[PDB]
Design a protein around this ligand. Sequence first.
Ligand SMILES: CN1CCN([C@H]2CC[C@@H](n3cc(-c4ccc(Oc5ccccc5)cc4)c4c(N)ncnc43)CC2)CC1
Ligand SMILES: [Ca+2]
Ligand SMILES: [Cl-]
Length: 431
Amino acid sequence: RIIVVALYDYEAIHHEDLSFQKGDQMVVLEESGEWWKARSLATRKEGYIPSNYVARVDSLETEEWFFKGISRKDAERQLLAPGNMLGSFMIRDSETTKGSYSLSVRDYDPRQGDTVKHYKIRTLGFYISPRSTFSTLQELVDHYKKGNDGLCQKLSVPCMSSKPQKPWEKDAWEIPRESLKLEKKLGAGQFGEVWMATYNKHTKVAVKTMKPGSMSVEAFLAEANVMKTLQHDKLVKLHAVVTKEPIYIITEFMAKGSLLDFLKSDEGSKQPLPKLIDFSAQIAEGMAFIEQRNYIHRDLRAANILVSASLVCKIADFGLARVIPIKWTAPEAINFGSFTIKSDVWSFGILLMEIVTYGRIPYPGMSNPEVIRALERGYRMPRPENCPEELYNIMMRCWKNRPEERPTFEYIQSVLDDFYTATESQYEEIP
Ligand SMILES: CN1CCN([C@H]2CC[C@@H](n3cc(-c4ccc(Oc5ccccc5)cc4)c4c(N)ncnc43)CC2)CC1
Ligand SMILES: [Ca+2]
Ligand SMILES: [Cl-]
């Protein structure tokens, strides 16, 4: 007897899945991953539901101010997302203190600007300061909603949260082409094209159509079966695959296209430096994930980075850059074809420059052999006007001749995330 409750409204779009509004309770019958067989207590109908749309009754996840499986940087990003205001807060799983919680509050500083402060929450009973004890988390928030214990700003409304992406159809990895309606061509290339399409007249998706050639079918599909496992918030979601030549790659749809185009647009020109640093931090996070898995990207640049409607950067074309440009390529890969994760680090340096210059072409005014001869002399791109010295230093560290002396994506991610934050200022220390 395991009962769950719905966190968001949901409309059925498949054959045997249920519709439920926010508040409806339900009985779990089968735990089959992303989809769960369940019986509604409101309609008495049995059918499948998305796992991430419900939570066990009176678990912390049912609360509006609680967020599960979310990092400190993600907490900062979500709290700083538009709509929220001064005092916006959340309670989350502590990244460093396992089994414990943390409070993240939106504050304003006359120096930096809009910021997010974090506080550790102690066990045995909960408290931030040893003076004010609280029986539950709910009392803990209820106290600070009017009048703080001496922390930045007082608590207000919980952090705003949108509906999660509805997971892909239950067991629909290899789909027939008939399910797709490639409605509008987004872009074309030497190896194929990209379309905005719909899946079964309800699910907006993107499709990379590959022209038949060097791309060996079985080998490619093996590589794609590898790609499916590499799921991460900073990697574009790979939904389905049409196995019959010509091969179609069905993925999540990114509303604002590539990072290059977005940067070159007006809204992209409206984006201040901290935001650009945030973009690069998200990219570095994705590459850190790829590094942890030991796989290699082989073609990192703003054109192969996609942007969501909510300005979330995701990596695309990962691994695909093998199964089938030197200005983004490390010297060792240019000369001896030795593509490693360090060459990807070099590429990340170039992409960093590309970001800070709002999509400008690297080495402006130079041809490919021009650049090649330049690199031998030990030449690097100069620091742009708007680029911070400390970020340029990161770029330069990415562009070291020896790939061995190049930083990992783990380090780069850590540095970029806390770029404006002194280590001692991550979590506030209250008396
Ligand atoms: C000129 N080019 C660079 C790319 N690009 C544009 C990049 C911007 C745009 N675009 C690419 C895609 C795209 C879709 C599938 C795709 O396939 C993958 C394969 C392996 C791993 C991940 C994705 C890669 C990119 C895309 C998307 N999913 N959502 C929204 N916009 C997208 C297509 C127009 C075009 C050919
Ligand atoms: Ca501190
Ligand atoms: Cl029942």
